Write a protein that binds this DNA or RNA. Sequence first.
DNA 1: ATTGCAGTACCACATTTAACCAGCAG
DNA 2: TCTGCTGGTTAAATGTGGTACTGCAA
Length: 168
Amino acid sequence: KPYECYICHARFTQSGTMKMHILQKHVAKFHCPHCDTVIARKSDLGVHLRKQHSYIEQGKKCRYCDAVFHERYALIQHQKSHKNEKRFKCDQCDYASRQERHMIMHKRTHTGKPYACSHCDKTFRQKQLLDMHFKRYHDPVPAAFVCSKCGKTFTRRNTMARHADNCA
DNA sequence: ATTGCAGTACCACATTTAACCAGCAG
DNA sequence: TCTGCTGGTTAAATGTGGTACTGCAA
Ligand SMILES: [Zn+2]
Ligand SMILES: [Zn+2]
Ligand SMILES: [Zn+2]
Ligand SMILES: [Zn+2]
Ligand SMILES: [Zn+2]
Ligand SMILES: [Zn+2]
C-alpha cells in the first residue's frame, strides 16, 4: 500500500496518515482545558477527557483517605496528597506507616506473635525477618565487619564505623 | 563488647495506566 | 481529503516486597 513519505520513506497506507507523519516528525499541541497535560493528537485529547473528566455518577473513595470524587482526575490527583506521606495511621497508638505491611506488624504489638520456630518454643512478632533466630540458634557465620586498619571485628557495621572514625 | 526487637533504608521486581500510533469508517 | 474513534502496543510511576540495617534498651 502506498504512499512513501519523501523525507523518510514511510510506509503509510493512506495519504492523510502519511501527512500526519510529516506533522508528527517533520511539533504540536493540544492542552487539556482542565488539566495541565498535553496530548500528541487531538483525538487522543478526546479520549483523555472522556476518561479523566467525565462525571462519575457514584463517587469513588480515596484508597487511603475518606474523600470521594466524581471526577477521575480529581481522584488521582488527591491520592497525590498521600504519596510519600505516612498514609496508614494507627488507631491504638500514634505510630504511622507509609506501607501497610508495616502497619500490620505494628498492630501486633498492641494485639499480641504468630511466627513460630519449628525447632523451639519461640514466637516472633514480625514476619520471617525474625526467623533469623533460626540461623543463629538452629545453626547451619555471623558477619565480620572489619575495621581499618586496626583490623578489629564488630558484629555490626554502625559500631565498626563509629570506631573507624577515630582509630590508629 | 553483645543481642533481640521494632521499625527504617535501600534496592529490585511486578502491576498499572495513560498517551502513542496506524489504520478505519463515515 | 477530513475528522473522530479505536484497539492493541509501550514505558514511567508506582505498588509490592525481601532484607540489610539501625537505635534502643536490656
Ligand atoms: Zn518523514
Ligand atoms: Zn485533563
Ligand atoms: Zn485521600
Ligand atoms: Zn499502634
Ligand atoms: Zn527456634
Ligand atoms: Zn580501628
